[PDB]
């Protein structure tokens, strides 16, 4: 037989567990396939539902009740405008995808057990897997043993004060103009 | 708010506006109808604007509260964790926990109040400082005397000084009318 890899579209002759395992792990095949599912995944969001319309005959009553109601104006952007605003909206969705607020990890940084939990390499459940998840690293740290005895006083000109809460770019003019107190 | 605004943006039909709020409050407060029959598109575009305005208002209030709470208190708190019984905390941090607890008490939200006591309690558990206050607000504001006794009892374990807690505890037990205890 021969193993056709349809992601790469390239044949490999006389399939064997070794050669096939080597190809599947291969970097090029990796990029090709990952990109393939990136496209096939972006399509379902890209594809418009385009559900079918069923139009019934409007009744005499609701045509009279809806005729007295005034006609609302509709807004339609220019092509040059709508291309840009679609770009912006899509790039905003991509932003909300990657946010993943971690601030808890920033709060406990100096806790006595911070090295056993949030480092995630040295954990128990996920710890052993990360080692086998390390790449083959072909060519070209926070150890767990830490104690409270290091950094006895968490504040000696060490810490940065907590980052301010974010704000929407649209409504950024909503902010109260002036603070209540004088910061330096 | 970005998830909410986006999910408002993705609403393609009037029927999906009932997901926000019921049919009556939309026709009354914002005066928009789901059963509206006619050319719907511009009407739904008007409805998204009228729905986004009030969300902008909610954003006004909640933004104000967050910026106050951060700008005054939360920005001054550098240690959110327990450390050890041999840790010392800075005086300004004590002061900001005290004032943050008074502010939280002023909000009169019991869940967030007990939370902000237990939140304030782990950074400094060993002083007896926040134990006494957290017995006081619960003995007077809420008027719950047993809860205060139980606060002082749990305070006997963590606090190192123990003298003020055990005096105020003697008093709480006296007024509670438990003499055998």
């Amino acid at each position: 037989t021969r193993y056709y890899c349809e992601y790469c579209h390239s044949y490999l002759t006389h399939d064997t567990l070794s050669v096939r395992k080597s190809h599947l792990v291969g970097k090029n095949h990796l990029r090709i396939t990952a990109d393939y599912y990136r496209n096939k995944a972006r399509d379902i969001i890209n594809k418009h539902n385009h559900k079918r319309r069923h139009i019934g005959k409007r009744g005499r009553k609701e045509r009279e009740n809806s005729s007295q109601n005034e006609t609302l104006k509709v807004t339609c952007l220019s092509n040059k405008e709508k291309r840009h605003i679609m770009h912006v909206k899509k790039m905003n969705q991509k932003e909300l995808a990657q946010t993943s607020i971690d601030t808890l990890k920033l709060l406990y940084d100096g806790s006595p057990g911070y090295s056993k939990v949030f480092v995630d390499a040295n954990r128990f459940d996920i710890g052993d897997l990360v080692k086998a998840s390390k790449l083959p690293q072909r060519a070209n740290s926070r150890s767990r043993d830490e104690t409270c005895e290091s950094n006895p006083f968490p504040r000696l000109n060490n810490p940065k004060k907590l980052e301010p809460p974010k704000i929407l770019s649209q409504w950024s003019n909503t902010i109260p103009k002036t603070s209540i107190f004088y910061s330096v | 708010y970005a998830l909410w605004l986006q999910r408002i943006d993705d609403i393609m039909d009037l029927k999906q506006l009932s997901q926000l709020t019921s049919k009556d409050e939309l026709l009354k407060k914002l005066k928009i109808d789901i059963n509206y029959s006619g050319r719907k598109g511009p009407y739904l575009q008007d409805a998204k604007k009228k729905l986004k305005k009030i969300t902008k208002e909610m954003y006004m209030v909640v933004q104000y509260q967050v910026l106050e709470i951060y700008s005054i208190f939360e920005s001054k708190i550098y240690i959110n964790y327990y450390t050890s019984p041999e840790t010392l905390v800075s005086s300004d941090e004590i002061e900001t926990w005290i004032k943050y607890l008074d502010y939280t008490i002023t909000l009169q939200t019991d869940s967030l109040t007990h939370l902000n006591f237990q939140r304030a309690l782990l950074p400094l558990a060993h002083y007896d400082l926040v134990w006494i206050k957290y017995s006081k607000w619960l003995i007077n504001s809420k008027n719950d005397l047993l809860g205060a006794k139980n606060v002082l009892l749990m305070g006997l374990k963590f606090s190192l000084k123990k003298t003020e807690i055990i005096k105020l505890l003697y008093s709480v037990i006296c007024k509670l009318n438990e003499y055998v205890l």
């Binding site: 301010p164 974010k166 704000i167 770019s169 002036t178 603070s179 107190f181 | 910026l67 700008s71």
Partner: peptide, 26 residues
């Protein structure tokens, strides 16, 4: 991908009188 969804809020200082001074004691 030039503008971003979120920014840190910037806010004006209130002239520093003895009422807006966070260090005031007396």
């Amino acid at each position: 991908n030039h503008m971003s969804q979120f920014i840190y809020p910037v806010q004006q200082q209130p002239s520093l009188n003895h009422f807006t001074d966070p260090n005031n004691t007396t």
